[PDB]
Design a protein around this ligand. Structure first.
Ligand SMILES: c1ccc([P+](c2ccccc2)(c2ccccc2)c2ccccc2)cc1
Ligand SMILES: c1ccc([P+](c2ccccc2)(c2ccccc2)c2ccccc2)cc1
Lengths: 275, 275
DNA sequence: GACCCTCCCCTTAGGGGAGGGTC
DNA sequence: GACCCTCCCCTTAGGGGAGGGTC
């Protein structure tokens, strides 16, 4: 025999008035009585129990329309409904976990590039391996490589990492080049930021790595003159100390910013493994 | 010197055409050139790099508008941006973890009620404790208790569990009542499905529990006649075997369904601890 | 004076067409 | 014949008012 106005229900069940009017229009939760003259909504006490399901399902993210079918299932079916919710949550969990790990890897590589000792100077450090996915360069060289060239690689990596690669790589035979027009890339590649199985990789792609070891490295902001100059520094560094190269030259490029406004600028790093 | 149509960009960066037009209108990613006669959009190769940030941020859920400010920050600021993303992810994680645990508890109590041996029959089982939050009943009894009476309790429990309580409880002194109008509740309560700290609980509420021990129990679907009949069975069961009661009578009620259409029906369970 | 009601506008990220040009 | 363009409608869950009755 006790009835409540929309405001009272709102204060009692901690649900906004607008939400009550909406659930009314949606036919999810309608007032027991509507005054035909004022259109005022009135609710009964026993009815409040229905807001328990609605609030709990809202808390777990169930869409309103699906709530309508939830209040129609039996306690047994509701049990299963929750089982399904757990499955989805475990699915959300590992997605966030993987993402949490990926982000951490990105920051690690990001910091490493911000902590670089100096630009335009050859350094010899002990590197850890870098997992990559590569494909033959098809005759492409430093002057004609395009972002579009990495299209097939990015698709695969995006399908397993989600976080699209930010670094673009290429490799070439270590030679005493006297001109850029003399060099041709062997492979182009993109590092993989995840260990998630890849969805049926075609044979024209190879999963491999930049092996851990001692590397002669040099980093700098790209410019045609810098590219040539720094490559020659690397070559001279190796000849001067008669070092022995045991891998191709690895070239990684990463933009310094992604602003469509500012003049584009890229960071380049060349590495060559030595005995 | 190489340019692409919207379709080509779509196939290259795996982004829908509609999305490209939208990012164009939003001024997040605009084509390098727009044909003044056909309005056809054309993109340059160097521009594709900007879709890397956009896609990665979309993958982590960053809203488009905030992406515009992300492509304006420095590599240092971007590093921090990710730090903030990790913080939010860890926040999402424990929320899902807690929810995963709560759901499991709900299913456990839900199953227990579906596996009940029989209705209207007294059983003596060894119960595990049930954490609850209670408040004095203020003279309320079986005939005048309302859903609204639990308003203050539900607010607090909802503030810590999120999953609003589904079970409503009450307690009363074990007496040889000959009529319902003779009984008055001592406390009304609602179990807590979480161990999450409660936000400043007022003193008119008490956090306590239904202690683990041996309980004389009985469950049934509510009806005025059943309520009285089953209470008398409990009283007789205890007197017949001269059992000693060491707690008040606990009364838990949970709806059998939350359909606003079907006739309401509730499941009731009475429990009294014995030495 | 508080409370309640009914429109009306608005948010986010595009998808699914319809009608008509354009590679 | 495929590709591309410009509207137009639509989704989800209400929030924030404006104008005017109603406790
Ligand atoms: C005493 C108790 C309840 C109502 P009524 C109501 C009146 C006429 C027709 C149907 C219902 C009500 C109506 C408008 C404002 C206040 C009270 C009423 C009864 C049960 C549930 C809701 C409303 C009136 C007097
Ligand atoms: C040869 C190479 C590029 C173009 P255009 C272009 C034409 C006129 C004015 C500005 C741009 C082009 C336009 C419409 C359809 C196809 C090609 C062109 C150039 C750079 C980037 C995008 C488009 C035309 C001939």
């Amino acid at each position: 025999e006790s009835y409540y106005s929309i405001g009272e229900v709102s204060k009692l069940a901690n649900v906004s008035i607008k939400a009550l009017r909406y659930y009314d229009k949606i036919d999810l939760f309608k007032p027991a009585y509507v005054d035909p003259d004022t259109s005022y909504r009135y609710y009964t006490d026993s009815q409040l129990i229905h807001l328990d399901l609605i609030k709990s399902l809202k808390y777990i993210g169930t869409p309103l329309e699906e709530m309508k079918k939830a209040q129609d299932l039996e306690m047994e079916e509701l049990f299963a409904f929750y089982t399904e919710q757990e499955r989805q949550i475990r699915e959300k969990l590992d997605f966030l976990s993987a993402l949490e790990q990926t982000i951490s890897l990105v920051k690690k590589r990001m910091k490493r590039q911000m902590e670089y000792p100096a630009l335009g100077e050859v350094f010899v450090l002990d590197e850890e391996e870098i997992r990559i996915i590569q494909t033959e360069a098809e005759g492409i060289g430093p002057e004609n490589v395009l972002n579009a060239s990495y299209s097939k690689l990015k698709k695969f990596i995006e399908s397993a990492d989600g976080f699209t690669n930010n670094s673009y790589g290429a490799t070439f035979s270590f030679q005493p080049y006297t001109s850029i027009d003399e060099m041709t890339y062997r492979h182009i590649f993109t590092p993989v930021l995840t260990n998630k199985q890849i969805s049926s990789i075609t044979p024209d792609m190879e999963i491999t790595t930049i092996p851990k070891g001692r590397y002669a490295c040099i980093a700098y902001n790209f410019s045609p003159e810098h590219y040539f100059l720094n490559l020659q520094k690397l070559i001279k560094y190796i000849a001067d100390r008669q070092l022995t190269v045991v891998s191709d030259v690895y070239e990684l490029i990463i933009p310094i910013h992604y602003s469509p406004k500012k003049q584009e600028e890229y960071r380049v790093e060349m590495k060559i493994r030595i005995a």
